[PDB]
Amino acid sequence: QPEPDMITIFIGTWNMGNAPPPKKITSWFLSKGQGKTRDDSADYIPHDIYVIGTQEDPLSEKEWLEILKHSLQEITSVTFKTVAIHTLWNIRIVVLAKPEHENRISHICTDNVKTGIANTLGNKGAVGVSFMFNGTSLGFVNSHLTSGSEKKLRRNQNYMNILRFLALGDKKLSPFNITHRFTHLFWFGDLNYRVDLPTWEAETIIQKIKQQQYADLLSHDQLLTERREQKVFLHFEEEEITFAPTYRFERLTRDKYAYTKQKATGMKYNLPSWCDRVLWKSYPLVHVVCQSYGSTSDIMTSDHSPVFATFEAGVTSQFVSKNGPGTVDSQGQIEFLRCYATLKTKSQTKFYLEFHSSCLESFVKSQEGENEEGSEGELVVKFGETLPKLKPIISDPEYLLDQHILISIKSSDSDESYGEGCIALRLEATETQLPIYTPLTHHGELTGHFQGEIKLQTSQ
Template identity: 25%
Template sequence: MTSLDLRILTFNCARALIDVSSFALLVLDPLFTHQSTPDIVVFSLQEIAPIAQSFLGGSYLQSYFGAFVDALNITAQTQGEHVYENIVAKNVGMTALMVFAKSDIVDRVRGIETGGAGVGMAEMGNKGAVGARIRWAGSGEEEDTYTTFVAAHLAPMEGAVQRRNEDWGNIVRNLVFTPERATSTSGTSVPGTAYDEQQPLLSHTDSSPSQHTIYTSSTTRSYLFLAGDLNYRTRDTPPDPNAYKSWPQPTSNRNAPYHFSKFLSSDQLTHEKDAGHTLHHLEEAPINFPPTYKYEHPFSSSSEPQETGSDGDDGSDDSNAPVITNDLQAAKNARFSKDPYATETWIWAKHRAPSWCDRILFFPSPALKVQKYAALPILSTSDHRPVALAASISVSAQDGTAAQEGEEMESPFPVNPLWKREREQARRREQVAGVVLYLATTNEGRMIAVAVAVGLFAGALALRRYLGYQVFL
């Protein structure tokens, strides 16, 4: 094995369970059509579930993680006898990371480290990042290879540019990798699927945390990928009521005033990165796809327009929006078109300027080859498009493209010496908030609350009767 073929997908799930069959067909299937099936598949997922389930974690997230496992299995089976093992499934609050590897390369996993940081209210995980660093055994005397994947979700709203930059700085300071579990080259103890924010994130210590941050590793053969809803917008203020009339529309003519490329010049992320304020040392492939946010949900002519509003946005009533009678068929047609972005129907939410919120970046290396960077069809469960990156990385010096010796990923921020304690405290706050929200916002939680209240009332009556009987005696 001289190289690894990667597919990285970022998707804001808008707190909704995906439709497995649609996701497999429209989102995952296109990832397998470039030359060969990927060796590694990575999902960066934001707002993976409602906030209560996300904060509680564990079994409360199992169905949400499981839906992505099922979708990938469906797609893999349609492409041949390919089997993928889920070697990482981690979340910090509402942000999650899943890493899959083909069964025939899992035995090359020599170790996995994970880490996470919350940057939302009280450092809880309504926004934040989760990462995994995987060590792949080299062939013979070849040096081992490290791949680092980070899923991130930064602060929303047009004017919060500085807050997004600060979120990134806090993620770099507080996301410290610690051992998940060791594996042998024979694969006898390969990690299995896990559905919670496991204790190894908090219970392991390391003698040199500075060697295990996002930007550093113990080898020069190391690759770093960051994917997520980074929330950088194309405006610094909310749009005017009539601004939507000039927003991008499907066309193959790049010279047209409403072609999506005209909006790229005002992309906040490009400006902030060029100024050295965020995502330091990372690069991005050219963007040749329309803005990924904020779409109205496709709806049939027999239903009213609805909007869940991810990132805390309020839904807006837009009774004059166009109607899509069959969004699945429209997405299929777009997928097989020579110019898919020119054949779709775009229905923009009028209170948010179309923006490239969903991005995938990487630390540049001559051994990393980008094959494709694209947005995928709009799904009716989210107001974001999924975005995918197809790439290959060298894991052998024989092909002459291995990472340069001595190349370093210099961290722009020092490690927070209190990162572990602060993450433990934030995790406790998440659990408390999760319980309260679960009892208040879910049918199951309300039933539990009623049952507890009835039990307490019955107990109080029984105690009162018992005490009254004792006084009478």
């Protein structure tokens, strides 16, 4: 029975509005409704992994797991295994997988982050799950961010707190936050970003939605504009939105948007918005293809519609050789030539690098670089040909070309990371000097760049 090199992943996000679901929710898992929908010919094909994020979820874990498992068994005739379930308040994440994957899944982690302080601490935040699927690390975040059209900067702050403090994946990757710990990271939820148009334009917006003309609405979507201005979700992807706004509906129909201010809303308007989203970030040159992104039309118990997204995701096998794991493969090496970091910092400490990868027995510390002043004010840290030769555990090119090197640049004075990035070993050539590049981030914000050349020696 061969190990897969691709799997499909279902991501669902649904703000349930504190109401129990209707009896049938299969359209959600089938990716049927509005937007980029799944072909009918695939309906009986199970996804490998189903990740379900809810917000305002009124159910117990047991109650929701029974509904989800029943739903999937009715669609696929497969009894899914529960990988993980984690709840913070009324924010929940469930991960289900086909039974054949039970012995491919390991290192399961869960965590939550509570956002805000005092007044603003007690219902918003995030839950997450991570695990290994054979040689591939997968992370999943379900966040419920701050509500309200005039709180976009609070949402951006909520995002940065969640990616700083959510403790998932390999704790040995100590310089790295969740935006660097996984081959594939999916981040979804009621992100609560709104269409920023005047209140007076509510009926005009509704008109546009009825005509399926989303362009003049999407150009005002706060998440798209904040992402274009590099305020949030830097280096994440989102499929094009081709479904109507998923909030705020009158319950028990989808015929009406309920936008007007009420005591129940704190006298706030809720103009139709794409609150409910799925984004992802995968390591460079790993296969990831969105195959659906849409909303259901037939699940109407909440003031939000459920959102679905599905992905093809490249995965690798748990590689064994005669040598590694448990020794090096002297036939393998990674060399960095002519490397330098450009940093936005005003500080003047010496810096060193750390190289982290599951292709190394443990992380590698460089010598300090040589600081120069850049033309336009910047700090340039030169490593030249000084970087330590990296010794992978396995030299087979079928393994090594699929790996990645995480890089942290750290202050000699504080040992704190000033920037983190990732280099793919999926090179055009081996035994050949080739350009490499990553942006560097810290707390998910841009802090610099790392560029140079690589020379990769494999057993071939």
